[PDB]
Amino acid sequence: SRAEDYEVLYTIGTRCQKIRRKSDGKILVWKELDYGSMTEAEKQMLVSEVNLLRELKHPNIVRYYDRIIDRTNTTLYIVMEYCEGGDLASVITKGTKERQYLDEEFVLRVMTQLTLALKECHRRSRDLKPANVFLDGKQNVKLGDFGVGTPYYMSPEQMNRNEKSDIWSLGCLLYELCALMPPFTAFSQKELAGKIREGKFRRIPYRYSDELNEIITRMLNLKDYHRPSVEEILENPLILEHHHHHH
Ligand SMILES: CCc1ccsc1-c1cnc(N)c([C@H]2CC[C@H](C(=O)O)CC2)n1
Ligand SMILES: [Cl-]
Ligand SMILES: [Cl-]
């Protein structure tokens, strides 16, 4: 459609902005992309890429609504859902500061809702990292598209040379949610690789049940074939109706 149909309220991060649709005042978000300096090839990839985004409809995946071309300032806007809770990275960062651990109930919601997101991605065949996981205003958890640093979540196989690879990464993410730090830490990737191949890490804090520790521990198995599948994860007695998405 057209940018004039929306009013920017303010910038979230750098560009992403919270916006209001004029027709009904609905609160949304858009992402600004300046293609002015792109080749025709880069733009064709962009077109198809954006095309695959409109296809994905799922409660646990950030919903995209529209693409908007402003050829005058060579900007493409991708209009999406507003997730008022922000991203999971900030939640973990915050926890670290106030030295306050997250509730097991929140960890179970994230496990449940991200596992369902993964199942969808696999079916239709995204980076499983805290910075790419978003919270809305009704306790729902949503996977985003994006989709120098140390690769904390790289799996043993995807580090030598797989859907069980996603399970490892989810393990790393839930582990980091609980402990406020990743299972494996190191100053260089080589040292990191060293620690991963060993497959050893601390138990998540004792405030968390043995059942939660067990499942996260399984996801962190060195053998992908010992890691639980999406199906096996959701059969876990920990996971209850209220841990799923609600409108
Ligand atoms: C409180 C708003 C906030 C703070 C940190 S992130 C964030 C927010 C809120 N709603 C959103 N829809 C999003 C995005 C960012 C861009 C993203 C992507 O790269 O595709 C989708 C989710 N962030
Ligand atoms: Cl602490
Ligand atoms: Cl501990």
DSSP-derived secondary structure for 159-182: T---HHHHHHHHHHHHHHHHHSS-
d(C-alpha 29, C-alpha 64), whole Å: 9
Buried b (16+ CB within 10 A) or exposed e, 5-30: ebeeeeeeeeeebebebeeeeeebbb
Residue 173's nearest CA partner among 246, 118, 242 is 118
**Residues with C-beta atoms within 5 A of ion ligand 2:** 99
Beta bridge partners of 6: 21
List the domain boundaries for the chain.
Answer: 1-39+63-83, 40-62+84-247
Beta bridge partners of 31: 16, 78
Whole-number CA gyration radius for the chain? 19
Q: At what angle do helices 163-179 and 88-97 cross, to 10 degrees?
A: 30
User: Do residues 113 and 141 lie in contact, with contact meaning Cβ atoms separated by under 8 Å?
Assistant: yes
Backbone angles phi, psi at 60, to 5 degrees: -105, 15
Q: Annotated catalytic, 136?
A: no
d(C-alpha 216, C-alpha 153), whole Å: 14
Burial class from Cβ neighbours inside 10 Å (0-12, 13-18, 19+) for residue 128 reads: buried
Which structure tokens are listed for 190?
């080589």
Backbone angles phi, psi at 163, to 5 degrees: -65, -30
Mutate to test the pocket of ligand 1, among 79, 82, 88, 142 (most ligand atoms within 8 A of CB): 82
CA distances from residue 151 to 33, 109, 148, 172 in whole angstroms, order as listed: 26, 25, 9, 11
Tokens 């296809």 sit on residue: 55
Establish whether residue 120 lines the binding site of ligand 1, counting it when its CB lies within 6 angstroms of any ligand atom.
no
> Domain 1-39+63-83, what architecture?
2-Layer Sandwich (3.30)
User: Do residues 156 and 195 lie in contact, with contact meaning Cβ atoms separated by under 8 Å?
Assistant: no
Looking at the CA of residue 145, tell me the nearest atom of ligand 1.
Answer: 20
Query: Residues preceding discontinuities in the chain at C–N > 2.5 Å?
Result: 14, 125, 147, 161
> Domain 40-62+84-247, what architecture?
Orthogonal Bundle (1.10)
Establish whether residue 153 lines the binding site of ligand 1, counting it when its CB lies within 6 angstroms of any ligand atom.
no
CA distances from residue 132 to 61, 114, 140, 173 in whole angstroms, order as listed: 11, 11, 14, 11
Beta bridge partners of 34: 75
CA 142 to chain centre: 7
Q: Give Cβ neighbours of residue 85 (< 8 Å, ≥ 6 apart).
A: 91, 134, 135, 136, 137
Looking at the CA of residue 85, tell me the nearest atom of ligand 1.
Answer: 1
d(C-alpha 203, C-alpha 64), whole Å: 38
d(C-alpha 31, C-alpha 18), whole Å: 9
CA distances from residue 12 to 32, 33, 41, 128 in whole angstroms, order as listed: 12, 15, 30, 21
Q: Provide the annotated binding site.
A: 12-16, 31
d(C-alpha 92, C-alpha 131), whole Å: 10
